[PDB]
């Protein structure tokens, strides 16, 4: 079915959910902390759930790539090799920025919110201002209590604000991996791609401290027990079966303006896709002379690859259903259907007036700022912006800095200087400034107008790229102790120093800060006119009879539908691939080059007990038609009785343009069976202690 | 069904063509001169069908697109704009060599032939020369009446030899192609890939003179009239229908040795694949700066592509299949159930080992053989050594000219020759041997060792190539007129020219006739060993009770089966594809750019009554498992009573490795759907003088 239903919308999908075959009571999915929705938790961009008593979590290999890339050499790859903890001891630390988000309480401060945002009156900072207050505020008294992390969601535009509570852990270990060629197969040449034969798997545990509470990793910490648990489906999972997903999607932008979708789909999805299979290119050939870049940028890349293949996928799609067109059909069909409405229609139209002129400003600045803000967010100079940023805000008091660098927020960013240790190789940065430098000196003039970069790049040419790239190379941040040192630094150190990464923070700061406050601005004038125009397009969408639900905004959502294929002209997508069309794309070579234990298991028939009688084999992968995106990566898929049947990882090549424009008759999830998870664990990549304490062995 | 079945095969298939359900009689297929089969004619490289009295012959498009790239500029391009006669004066010539051939009478020499053979005892040379004295012989007397063209085939490695008789209409015209957006809809993206949506037809006329003998283009030729003409079917096609295909398919490997199989995997195939795709790129450049290089290349360009794709097909195939495991697996079966057997088993055996003494000599300079038989065939040097070796032979008496190379083949000799005029320009000739001399140049030095080659170099990098390139650009072969000049010319001329290509064709002449000779005389030792061997795996093979039919050896082939599509792991390939599936396909951007007509017709819904109820639409293309190969490109598909519903163009992606190893699972044939032909002729690109001349007005 199509929609990202928030809890608070179970009442409206309860009839839908038991029509679908849902056998639970919607009702006991209405309790969030409950079996099994208490279950289900986030990651921070990902989806994961608990499947034993003491914390075991499951989620995606991709999900869990960043845990395994930071464990990994160029020796000891363990996103190639499998990783196994055969004891509680042998579980790495997934590191120090791993996150466990358990769902303690969701309150709507709607209300509050909207008098916080209306105290501001017409001034737009003031209301950004207040907004960033009123967040604060609640986030404080929720935070009150220790081992708690408490976030402000923004639905509909602002007609709706709820504070979410989570039990925060911050000890998170790798337990289980499969090879790199289950965990990933088919690698980018499947992505985004059904038929699917991917394993896409991995297996933390969560901790806490001795006295129960959250902590950073200790020898010390003892296992999470949670609350609830899922259990692996007893029930074969079949064509038609009822799934249902709740998982954290993070942006949907089925809302958007017809122009924001045209700006996004004429420039940055064009645009990121060709600057991003550039700098994989360099990433490649830099990790082929040197297989410590291979490991350290393999997250980056894996990361890197996924958006650029769906930025290449959207376009395809937007062409497919001529998401223009539909885009402009929708925006004028409201805004007629607004003139129609006599009085009350008046406000929602000049909202939408308000939004357009919003579209006017970013025209011949864009490659520039592209350029800019990638040269900026490489590692070096980033650490230096984020370090000296912090400075700044630390003369602050805490209850007026910048978010992401409140007190709150410190031991995050000093987990991102830690984790760069892993990520980071000076001559592969060297030449990531290099590549962004040289899109920026290839600009016209007329766009090469960032005063700070001209006077340190003194010329336009490849010789002003190497002679700043070289001048950048004097850095000492490349050391972990001196992004440690800088962390704890009074801004008047920043000022005073002769390392050309912070001497270059200091200078473009003021114009970085510039920038923000133009953002907030921005944010505060849309901060009436989104929710009143979303709030018009939700009533002409409900006047029309269509679906009406939030865009996505990385909060706790359920979708729901059946296990099905879908079809195009020539072709029938079959709902499950089993363990022979693994073996049948077998090349021997990357990205298709399965472990041996599986082409031989799957060789002898060695089924392992849970080959589907209906298939004749063991099922890998499954599709169905639930409405998910990024984020929902890690969901466990519950069937009818609340078992899990799967994990969701991906979509097929249809699905990536429903993130604009939602596609029923071609927008599948992509799953991996529960039953292909534990015949990894059985016949391939064993690991026996799972089994047990999962109690499938 | 497996097997391309001989038509003297017909008692072993009348009761699977039968069962398929076939209602014509076999007896009636047994009639090759009668009805249906006497409408089934060779173009030599491709299969069409008499469709009309007055000589109208249906084929493919990529069959036709040699002739419509001959009648084709810059200016006035065919292969995009597509090409319509709206009566006989319209019609353009398909050009000198293109031909059609009515089949006759077929006769088995088998034992005249092996006598010839036995006859001349233990000497390979002399083996050689008395199979082509007696293949010349049956030939030279079968040629005897004016209009008629033989063609001696020997078949399962000589264990069978038959003479074709053929009726040679040597004036061929074009009346009708699509639009190319239509005739290769999906161009190189789409090739050898179900779903398909290709309109792959064209339709020529087959002239003789007033007299009703075959000559050549004349203004005052009228239209053969053949015998025997198929009509469009009346049943509409439905899945599970029994079809079957009559057609000259050219070469399959089935009987190869397991050392033949895997030198093609790992060595040709790997390597065809790479040099083409780096000239098809070449070729693309050129094309992209020079409209009339495109124009001028684009049949070299085709024919490339879809060799180049078919390898990486087939590479990709041996591997589903694990065709070499198949190969060496038959070939162990066979030496072994040889053991088995005494005195009937030893031949065999004695064969087996000298056919693989072939293979080695092949190995050693198979590089430099691939480099510079390319470069030997580039369109200057090769036209040379064609115009000097035919003077060679002319100083002979005809009898005892080489094959090719006789009274007989001057006319396609002089054919070519004029063909090249639409075909050659300079500077892209130059950049062809270019490459392949730098191929030959980056050779290892004990590789290189082509004497002539060298001297011609006088070095072994990019300068030396260069200057041989510069050197051979001062040949006046670039005109037709000194080509037709050359055509005529004594040994003598030749070897007085200053003329660089003839000089170089006079220098390596000598080691070509070596090589030649060395080739007959493995030839020889071939003519017992290999009959010997592949009489062996045959017996072995119907020990077996496996299908028992010649490898391809361009001569005329049965194969059936039924309407049917093909699974894969995750997949259901349907039989049809229909017009929404075009539609869906448009990109406006080659390849997927259809004409506007089309568009407009399919979003109307004028379905101009070929709407088959059973798929909502007009069915484009279909698959069935037939068993075809290169040669097979314009069969006619015939219905259960014998009426054309459609023409054999393709195959899909996994049947491609069906010509080393049979995989019934996924081997299909892609046809164009009369009903498409009809509806582009009806809807898109007008054809209504052949609409009422086919019976469909």
Known sequence: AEGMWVPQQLPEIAGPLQKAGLKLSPEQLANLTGDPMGAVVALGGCTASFVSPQGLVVTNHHCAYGAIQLNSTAQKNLIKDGFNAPTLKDELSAGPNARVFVLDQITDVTAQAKAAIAGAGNDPLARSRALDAFDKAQVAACEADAGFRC?????????????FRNMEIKDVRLVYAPPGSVGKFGGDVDNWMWPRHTGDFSFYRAYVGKDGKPAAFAADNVPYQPKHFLKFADQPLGADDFVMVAGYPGRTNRYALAGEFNETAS??????????????????????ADADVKVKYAATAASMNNVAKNYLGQLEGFKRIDAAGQKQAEEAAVLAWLKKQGAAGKPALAAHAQLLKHLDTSKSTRERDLFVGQFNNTSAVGAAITLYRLSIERSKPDAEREAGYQERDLTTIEGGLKQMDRRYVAKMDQQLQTYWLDQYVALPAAQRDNEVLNKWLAGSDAAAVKSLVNKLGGTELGSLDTRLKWFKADRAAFEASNDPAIQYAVAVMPALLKQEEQKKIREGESLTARPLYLQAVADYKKSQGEFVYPDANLSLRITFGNVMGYGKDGVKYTPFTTLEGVAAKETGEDPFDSPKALLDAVKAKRYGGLEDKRLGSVPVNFLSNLDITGGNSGSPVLDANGKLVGLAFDGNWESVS????????????????????????????????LLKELNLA
Chains 1, 2 share one sequence.
């Open 267 to 288: 420039f940055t999805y064009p645009t990121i896709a060709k600057h991003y299979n550039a700098v994989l290119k360099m990433i490649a050939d830099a990790g082929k």
């Open 151 to 163: 976030r402000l969601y923004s639905f509909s535009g602002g007609n709706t604000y709820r504070l």
């Open 658 to 689: 429903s993130n604009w424009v939602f596609d029923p008759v071609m927008t599948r999830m992509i799953a991996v069976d529960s039953r292909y998870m534990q015949w990894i664990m059985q016949e391939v990549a064993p690991a026996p202690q």
